[PDB]
Amino acid sequence: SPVVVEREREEFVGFFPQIVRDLTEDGIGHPEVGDAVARLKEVLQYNAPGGKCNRGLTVVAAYRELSGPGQKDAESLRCALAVGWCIELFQAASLVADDIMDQSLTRRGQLCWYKKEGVGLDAINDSFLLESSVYRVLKKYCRQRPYYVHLLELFLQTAYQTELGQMLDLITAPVSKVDLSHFSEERYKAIVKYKTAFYSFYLPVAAAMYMVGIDSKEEHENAKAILLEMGEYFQIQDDYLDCFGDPALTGAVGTDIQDNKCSWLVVQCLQRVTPEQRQLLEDNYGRKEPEKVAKVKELYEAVGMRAAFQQYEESSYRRLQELIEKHSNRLPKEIFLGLAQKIYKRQK
Amino acid sequence: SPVVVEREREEFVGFFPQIVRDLTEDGIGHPEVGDAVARLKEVLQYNAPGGKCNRGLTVVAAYRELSGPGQKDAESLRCALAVGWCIELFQAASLVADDIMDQSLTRRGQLCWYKKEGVGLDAINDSFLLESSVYRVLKKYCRQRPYYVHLLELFLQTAYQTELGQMLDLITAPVSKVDLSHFSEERYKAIVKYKTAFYSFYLPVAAAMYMVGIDSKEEHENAKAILLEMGEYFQIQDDYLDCFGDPALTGAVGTDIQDNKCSWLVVQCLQRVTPEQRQLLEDNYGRKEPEKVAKVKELYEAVGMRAAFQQYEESSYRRLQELIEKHSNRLPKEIFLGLAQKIYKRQK
């Protein structure tokens, strides 16, 4: 529901300064480090805010579907928000780093933090601080709570998992050289499982689970199961909406495949190929040549990926509705649905 | 004692593969991420090992001075080592990053990991993984131990503190522009308090304190007090031994002040100056010009820093022997001494 979804939406956003005061307020006037904490504010404000928040929001919603009448005090509700901005600072720490290693230019419609003159390679250390900001906020909100260690272990573990998916990516599709040898489906599914799925789906729900006390191992596994198919499919749909999409498109409906970006479409091409066609690609693909690009998509339409998407889309839903069944024994399905109802949109 | 000091020394080093198997063994054959964990091994082996180990060693020694007959099982002893290699992986995560932001060339007599062809800016993510390796090892060795959360909180907090000292540094002495305006004593003392003191002295001892159960807040403060003067003085002596030293010098007795490096010597010059002399510097200092450099040190000798070092040296010892008193009420002085007996060497 708009009315509700929005309300939650706005309560989240409106909480940012708070996290901001948290992180810096007392640091701001320190006779020693005050200068540092002062640039920290800037980094925080430049980078953290401004995305969609779906990720952090997912926590709040989840706790709301999980908590009982008992646990809806205002305090509890603030931790949910706090714990929410945590995934939000986590992701920002990512993006910053990631922009340097991709030598990107823009993000969130801003110029990449590293590109800001005077900054540069210092952003290397800023993503580090953004990272520890995450643990500062938990110590501040969750320190005396039965689930503190779990959250700490939760965040840390996913940090690792995602860094490997990042690592995988970085090896597979090196941003200064084409080579489509390494573009396998297992590898794509694997780049996707670790670089975003874990922190984008599982993490948010897993945090609300432990916060209501569901620490059952095999309950984190029922969760991990459904959620990870969601996340995979989510990646895939982005990839699709990336080139074959437009109508109402989530702001910037621009692109990239000039940056030899290993995507499901690409992988799906390589399977419906001919050595010749492969060569069509092999050469061109990963190019910032207007004409070349166009041809590349001729290729995709040439092979009809437009169809395959709808083919895949039509399966993911199904598998989901089951996986819910196989996995929503103990936890409220409303969660997975809600989550799902805003993922599956489809756009062709 | 050589016999003992060495023994501990060698027990530490000989434990590395172990940490190494820990971190990767099961990652090595994963159908999904195996490739990643495999490069992780390389990163670990390239970077972690090979320094002096004083830092990690300090833990082992400390626990040995702290534990009672009860806690000297072999298991306990392994955690001390494990917990030791942790500061060692912590520092490596640092150095890697730091080499990129200084655009350094060499380290530990190896070529900087980022400089290795094929690597590059990917090292950005490798220092991240080196970082999470630290928390992997604690979860593995300390997870079911009364002091687990403290250690986790300990490491995380210092990670932050040091990142600010790094941040301070990066702003003060920007590696592509001279400006000696920002070279204050309070700032140097502050760059030193956060970028190394905390993780190089306090962290090791603080980890052995909590491991024997000394979690008393004001006992971490008695510790923090003495140790931080040690660390400061340690920095200062390096700075000194940097230019005015040689005889037996800890391997490479080369240099840097070509990289406009904010050091105690420099700061100490600016105080014994003349606007003219300041100009001698202002221009030259931070140069990779054979002749220029020489002149710079004329300046330091010109002003006689050779004397001031010995002046300062002669105070640090004193203040120490007191600070021990003011602070070694509850904890064994042997610790601070031992620590100290291998710091104060002096070299002129």
Q: How many CB atoms lie within 10 A of CB B345?
A: 11
- Report the C-alpha gap between B42 and B33 in whole angstroms: 15
Torsion over CA: B283, B286, B291, B297 (sign):
positive
The answer to whether B168 touches B191, Cβ cutoff 8 Å, is yes
- Report the C-alpha gap between A212 and B84 in whole angstroms: 36
Strands (E), chain B: 106-107, 110-111
Torsion over CA: B62, B68, B69, B72 (sign):
negative
Q: Does A160 sit within 8 Å of B136, measured CB to CB?
A: yes
The answer to whether A107 touches A95, Cβ cutoff 8 Å, is yes
- Report the C-alpha gap between B92 and A14 in whole angstroms: 39
Q: What's the token pair of residue A98?
A: 């990631």
> Looking at the complex, does the CB of residue B279 fall below 8 Å from at least one CB of chain A?
no
A residues 158-177 closer than 8 Å to B (CB): 159-160, 163-168, 170-171
Mapping DSSP to helix (H, G, I), strand (E, B) and coil, where does residue B106 land?
strand
Mapping DSSP to helix (H, G, I), strand (E, B) and coil, where does residue B160 land?
helix
- Report the C-alpha gap between B199 and B55 in whole angstroms: 9
The answer to whether A184 touches A267, Cβ cutoff 8 Å, is yes
Taking each helix axis from N to C terminus, what angle separates A123-142 and A148-172, rounded to the nearest 10 degrees?
Answer: 160
Q: In terms of Cα–Cα distance, which of B260, B268, B253 is closest to B305?
A: B268
Q: Looking at the complex, report in whole angstroms how far the Cα of residue A103 sits from the nearest Cα belonging to chain B.
A: 10
State how far Cα B67 lies from the chain centre.
25
- Report the C-alpha gap between B102 and A203 in whole angstroms: 35
> Looking at the complex, does the CB of residue B39 fall below 8 Å from at least one CB of chain A?
yes
Q: In terms of Cα–Cα distance, which of A214, A309, A203 is closest to A264?
A: A309
Q: In terms of Cα–Cα distance, which of A226, A222, A233 is closest to A196?
A: A233
Please write down the long-range contacts of A179-185, taking CB distance under 8 Å and 24 or more positions apart: A180/A266, A180/A270, A180/A278, A180/A281, A180/A282, A180/A285, A182/A262, A183/A262, A183/A266, A183/A267, A183/A270, A184/A267, A185/A267, A185/A271
State how far Cα A245 lies from the chain centre.
20
- Report the C-alpha gap between B59 and B247 in whole angstroms: 29
- Report the C-alpha gap between B211 and B204 in whole angstroms: 11
Mapping DSSP to helix (H, G, I), strand (E, B) and coil, where does residue B265 land?
helix
Torsion over CA: A87, A90, A92, A97 (sign):
negative
DSSP H or E run through B37: helix B34-47
CA–CA distance from B219 to each of B2, B284, B309 (Å)?
30, 47, 32
DSSP single-letter state for residue B113: G
- Report the C-alpha gap between B43 and B308 in whole angstroms: 42
The answer to whether B134 touches B156, Cβ cutoff 8 Å, is no
DSSP single-letter state for residue B198: I
> Looking at the complex, does the CB of residue A229 fall below 8 Å from at least one CB of chain B?
no
State how far Cα B335 lies from the chain centre.
18
| Resolution in Å, one decimal place | 2.5
Q: Does B32 sit within 8 Å of A167, measured CB to CB?
A: no
Q: Which residues contact A186 (CB under 8 A, 6 or more apart)?
A: B31, B32
Q: In terms of Cα–Cα distance, which of A125, A99, A117 is closest to B170?
A: A125
The answer to whether B122 touches B162, Cβ cutoff 8 Å, is no
Q: Looking at the complex, report in whole angstroms how far the Cα of residue A123 sits from the nearest Cα belonging to chain B.
A: 9
Q: Looking at the complex, report in whole angstroms how far the Cα of residue A86 sits from the nearest Cα belonging to chain B.
A: 15
> Looking at the complex, does the CB of residue B139 fall below 8 Å from at least one CB of chain A?
yes
DSSP single-letter state for residue B110: E
- Report the C-alpha gap between B279 and B79 in whole angstroms: 54
Q: Using CB atoms within 10 A of its CB, is residue A173 exposed (0-12), middle (13-18) or buried (19+)?
A: buried
Q: Which residues contact A282 (CB under 8 A, 6 or more apart)?
A: A178, A180
Q: Does B100 sit within 8 Å of A121, measured CB to CB?
A: yes
Q: In terms of Cα–Cα distance, which of B347, B316, B157 is closest to B228?
A: B316
Dmax of chain A from CA atoms?
67
User: Which residues from B are below 8 Å from A124, CB to CB?
Assistant: 97, 100-101, 124
Dmax of chain B from CA atoms?
67
The answer to whether A123 touches A96, Cβ cutoff 8 Å, is yes
Q: Parallel, antiparallel, or unpaired: how do β-strands A110-111 and A106-107 relate?
A: antiparallel
State how far Cα A34 lies from the chain centre.
32
Phi-psi region of A204 (alpha: psi -120 to 50; beta: other; left: phi over 0): alpha
Q: Parallel, antiparallel, or unpaired: how do β-strands A106-107 and B106-107 relate?
A: unpaired
Q: Which residues contact A41 (CB under 8 A, 6 or more apart)?
A: A20, A23, A24, A28
Phi, psi for residue A137 in degrees, rounded to 5: -65, -35
Q: What's the token pair of residue B118?
A: 């094929």
Phi-psi region of A144 (alpha: psi -120 to 50; beta: other; left: phi over 0): beta
> Looking at the complex, does the CB of residue A249 fall below 8 Å from at least one CB of chain B?
no
The answer to whether A110 touches A45, Cβ cutoff 8 Å, is no
HEC string of chain A? CHHHHHHHHHHHHCCHHHHHHHHHCCCCCCCCCHHHHHHHHHHHHHHCCCCCCHHHHHHHHHHHHHCCCCCCCHHHHHHHHHHHHHHHHHHHHHHHHHHHCCCCCEECCEECHHHCCCCHHHHHHHHHHHHHHHHHHHHHHHCCCCCHHHHHHHHHHHHHHHHHHHHHHHHHCCCCCCCCCCCCHHHHHHHHHHHHHHHHHHHHHHHHHHHHCCCCHHHHHHHHHHHHHHHHHHHHHHHHHHHHCCCCCCCCCCCCCCCCCCCHHHHHHHHCCCHHHHHHHHHCCCCCCHHHHHHHHHHHHHCCHHHHHHHHHHHHHHHHHHHHHHHCCCCCHHHHHHHHCCCCCCCC
Q: In terms of Cα–Cα distance, which of B202, B207, B227 is closest to B337?
A: B227
The answer to whether A82 touches A139, Cβ cutoff 8 Å, is no
Could you give the domains of chain B?
Answer: 1-348 (1.10.600.10)
- Report the C-alpha gap between B295 and B299 in whole angstroms: 6
- Report the C-alpha gap between A317 and A233 in whole angstroms: 9
Phi, psi for residue A232 in degrees, rounded to 5: -60, -60
CA–CA distance from A249 to each of A104, A106, A151, A243 (Å)?
21, 18, 35, 11
Choose the mutation target among A86, A121, A157, A198 for the interface with B, i.e. most B CBs under 10 Å.
A121
B125: nearest CB among A31, A37, A101: A101
Q: Which residues contact B75 (CB under 8 A, 6 or more apart)?
A: none
Mapping DSSP to helix (H, G, I), strand (E, B) and coil, where does residue B138 land?
helix
Torsion over CA: A239, A240, A244, A246 (sign):
negative
The answer to whether A85 touches A232, Cβ cutoff 8 Å, is no
The answer to whether A125 touches A36, Cβ cutoff 8 Å, is no
Q: How many CB atoms lie within 10 A of CB A160?
A: 19
B residues 76-135 closer than 8 Å to A (CB): 97, 100-101, 103, 121-122, 124-126, 128-129, 132, 135
User: Which residues from A are below 8 Å from B103, CB to CB?
Assistant: 121
- Report the C-alpha gap between B261 and B252 in whole angstroms: 18
